[PDB]
Structures are given as C-alpha cells and as structure tokens.
Design a protein around this ligand. Structure first.
Ligand SMILES: *CC(=O)NCC1CCN(C(=O)C2(Oc3ccc(Cl)cc3)CCC(F)(F)CC2)CC1
Ligand SMILES: *CC(=O)NCC1CCN(C(=O)C2(Oc3ccc(Cl)cc3)CCC(F)(F)CC2)CC1
Ligand SMILES: [Mg+2]
Ligand SMILES: [Mg+2]
Ligand SMILES: [Mg+2]
Ligand SMILES: [Mg+2]
Ligand SMILES: [Mg+2]
Ligand SMILES: [Mg+2]
Lengths: 236, 5, 236, 5
C-alpha cells in the first residue's frame, strides 16, 4: 500500500540496508512492498522476505512466551489476584503476532505459491506456509486449533512430497523443511516418535549424499545436519 | 526450545 | 491519546510487563500514557519512563550510525553511484529518531519539569532533557545545530547546578548526569579537556564520599564510577 | 563509543 510508489529495485535495496541496520520491521515492510509489485522473487529476494518476517515473528513469539508464563503463574493456587492486565497485554501481543502471520500467509496465497513452478521456489514458499500456520498453532486455544494444525501439516506435507521427488537429500531447503516439520511433529502434533524418526532419517540420508558436494555446499548442508542432531539430542 | 530455520 | 481510556495503574503495570518481555516500544507508549494522566511520577515510574525511551532511541541511534557509515562510504572517491536509496532510508530512520526525541522533550515540557520541585526529580528530568537534545545534536547538520547543542548544554548545566547544591557527590543521578554531560563535552561540544576534567573531578569527589554509604548505595555509586574510569581510559 | 546511563 504505502510502498506502492517506490521502485521494486529500491525496495529490495532498502530491505538489504534494513537488514544491515537490524531494522527487521522495516525490512519486512520493504519486502511486502516488493512482493506486491507482482513479479516472482529470485532466490536472494525469497531469502530477504523470509529473514525479515522470521525476525519479526521471532521477537513476537519470545515476548508472547514471557507473557504467557507470567499469566500461567498468576492462575496458580496462592497467587494474589492482579486484575485483567496480564491477560489483556498477552492478548495484545498475541493479536499482533497473528496479524504478522496472516500478512505472510496472505503474500504466499496472493500470489507467490501459485506462480512458483520450480521445485526450489515452491518448496521454499510451502515451508513458509507450514511455519506461519505452526506459529498460529502455538497460540491457538479455540475451535480453530485443529484446523490451524492441519493447515500447517498440509503445507509441510506438500513441501516434503515435492522435495523428496525433486531435490537431493542434502539440499538446504529440503533439510530445513525436514528440521521444521520434525519440530512441528514434536511441539504441535504431539507426535514425538514421528519427530525423532523424521530427524534421524533426514540426517542419515543427507550423510550418504555429502560425498557429492563442493566445500561450500558441504558447509551449508552439515550446518543444518548439526541442528537435526541437536534436536535428536534434546529429544533422546 | 528446539532448532528451526 | 490511545491510552486515554486505560487506568494509570494499569499503564504502569503493563509498562513493567513490556519491560520483562523486552517490548520497549510498548513500554514507552504505556509510560507516555501514564505521564499524560497529569500526575507527578514516583522514582520507580521515572525509571520506567527513562528505561523505555532509552532502549527505543538506543536502537534508532545504532541503526542511524550503521546507515550513516554506509552513506559516508558511498560519497568516497571511486564508489560507483547507487542512487538516492541510502540517503532516503537514513533520512527515514533519522526522522523517526527525531520524532521520539521530540516526544520525550514534549513530555518533559508538558509538564514534568515544571511540576518537579524535589532535587531528585528535577535533576532526573533535566538530565533527560540534556540527553534527548544530545541525541538530536548527533544527527543535526543544519542551521539549528548550534541551538540544539546549546539547548542540551543549558539543560545539563541547570541539572549540574542543582545536583551540586542539593545532592551528595555519590548520588547515582548526580553521577550519571556528570557521566553524560562529560560525554556531551567530548562528543558534541568538541571540548575533550572539559570532558576529561569533569569525569576526573566527579570520580575523585565520589571516591571521598564512599565511606558514608551502605553496601547497597556503595554498589550503585561504584558501578557508575567505573563508567567514568572507563571513559577516562578511552580518552587518555 | 563512550559510556552513558
Ligand atoms: C533461495 C535459496 O536457495 N534459499 C535457501 C538458502 C539455504 C541456506 N541459507 C541459510 O541461511 C541457512 O539454512 C537455511 C535457511 C533457510 C531455509 Cl528455508 C533452509 C536452510 C541458515 C541455517 C544454517 F544452518 F546456518 C545453514 C544456512 C540461505 C538460504
Ligand atoms: C528514581 C531514581 O532515583 N532513579 C535513579 C536510579 C539510579 C540507579 N539506577 C540504575 O539503573 C543505574 O544507574 C543510573 C541510571 C539512571 C540514571 Cl539517570 C543514573 C544512574 C544504571 C547504571 C549502573 F551503572 F548500573 C548503576 C545503576 C536505577 C535508577
Ligand atoms: Mg518500476
Ligand atoms: Mg487471542
Ligand atoms: Mg517416513
Ligand atoms: Mg483513574
Ligand atoms: Mg534529516
Ligand atoms: Mg568545574
């Protein structure tokens, strides 16, 4: 909307500047503007989009967890009543978080995903779709909790199916997708065995393909493999 | 919390 | 404005929650709301106000310095032209920063300072006045640079005069004021000898009064004394 | 940068 008058190239340039300045809200707005120009995004541009919103929602999630913990403590036995302020402020942060998720999901639905034909782009966007439904799921408590969870699962599953067909087992997008879908199983779907199985199988299949990679590709793949191992260690 | 990317 | 319908006590409670959640923009808005209720602030409340805006403007200053450095490099010989984007975005951040400073100065002028009769409150607010004019000075480049600098100097000077008359040399507000006024001299007023002299004299006069303090007062005083020493080491 | 509080 407000970025309608700025050149696409200028928005991209400014997103990169905002990243350098750790101005992630600005970075997200610039990339939102870029997406709304209607052209497909390059790999670098998709990274700017994801980095920006990851940082924004990351901060909101951290704040929501702080406030939720305080709220939970206030509802324990022996806690002397403090009024509606804790709930109200947790709700405020929660609503802002949901707004950011809805914004990202909106961009994916209008029209990033439908125009993404290459495996690398389509999987990247579907992973994002899974991730932002997962963030919605983390705060969901009502009649829509189950549908939100299934929306996350559905997006992750479509991404997994394409990634298995079209990309090598060491592909960083394939690896990152599996990492996050594994976390979905553990943290959202109450399926810790599925989480562990997915992380293990992904790790082992990547290990067997490392021999094919250059030094630079090896670096990115092994970094994510270490995250899979970290989670497995956390869970076993 | 577990690692995601 | 938007906080007009919330109870003063609720605003204070929410500012404390926002602090715990590291939501400093929210914290500042809540405290702005509290100030606008029109009642004087307690010591704890003055701390919430200062903490909130310190963090907000601190982030803006850090971002402005990043962007200014990029802009400066783009104006060196051999740098291949990139268009107006760097200047535009530095200006955007700069304007937002100035807006925050103007907001704080507004609160001090309407009507925190005029209603502050006790030395501890009046010095606290005048120090803030000096600080936010200093932040304006850091980005000032036009015909108002000199007047902005003199506004900072004037506020700091009135604060110093009251603090010397009314507070012990170990008082943390007196110490923090002197620390910052010293930085003003070094960084803004191009008076490094005045900066060094002020830091030295403040340190030595505090040292001689430490014997009067309890363990808790000793802790706060010596912490700020170490900052004075750190600056002196940086400058000599 | 120098220390302020
Ligand atoms: C367009 C494109 O190919 N983007 C993906 C690319 C993968 C590597 N990368 C990273 O920043 C790290 O890994 C991922 C980030 C995002 C996604 Cl969706 C998957 C992997 C970040 C984590 C790491 F462990 F440090 C490895 C690199 C750049 C973007
Ligand atoms: C109402 C009141 O008395 N507020 C001042 C009080 C001083 C101590 N303090 C701090 O957080 C530290 O020092 C200052 C902060 C602000 C100001 Cl204006 C002066 C001193 C923070 C720096 C430190 F070095 F860690 C020492 C304490 C709480 C507020
Ligand atoms: Mg154009
Ligand atoms: Mg809600
Ligand atoms: Mg399987
Ligand atoms: Mg009232
Ligand atoms: Mg300007
Ligand atoms: Mg003197």
């Amino acid at each position: 909307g407000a970025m309608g008058s700025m050149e696409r190239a200028s928005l991209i340039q400014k997103a990169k500047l905002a990243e350098q300045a750790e101005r992630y809200e600005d970075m997200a707005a610039f990339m939102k503007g870029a997406v709304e120009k209607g052209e497909e995004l390059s790999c670098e541009e998709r990274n700017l989009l994801s980095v920006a919103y990851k940082n924004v929602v990351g901060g909101q999630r951290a704040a929501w967890r702080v406030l939720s913990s305080i709220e939970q403590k206030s509802n324990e036995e022996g806690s002397e009543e403090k009024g509606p302020e804790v709930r109200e402020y947790r709700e405020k942060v929660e609503t802002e978080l949901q707004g950011v998720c809805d914004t990202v999901l909106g961009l994916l639905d209008s029209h990033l995903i439908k125009e993404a034909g290459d495996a690398e782009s389509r999987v990247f966007y579907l992973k994002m779709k899974g991730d932002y439904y997962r963030y919605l799921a983390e705060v969901a408590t009502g009649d829509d909790k189950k549908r939100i969870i299934d929306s996350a699962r559905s997006a992750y599953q479509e991404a997994m199916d394409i990634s298995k067909k079209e990309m090598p087992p060491t592909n960083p997008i394939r690896l990152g997708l599996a990492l996050n879908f594994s976390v979905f199983h553990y943290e959202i779907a109450n399926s810790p065995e599925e989480a562990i199985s997915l992380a293990k199988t992904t790790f082992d299949e990547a290990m067997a393909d490392l021999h094919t990679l250059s030094e630079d590709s090896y670096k990115d793949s092994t970094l994510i493999m270490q995250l899979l191992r970290d989670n497995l260690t956390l869970w076993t | 919390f577990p690692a995601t990317v």
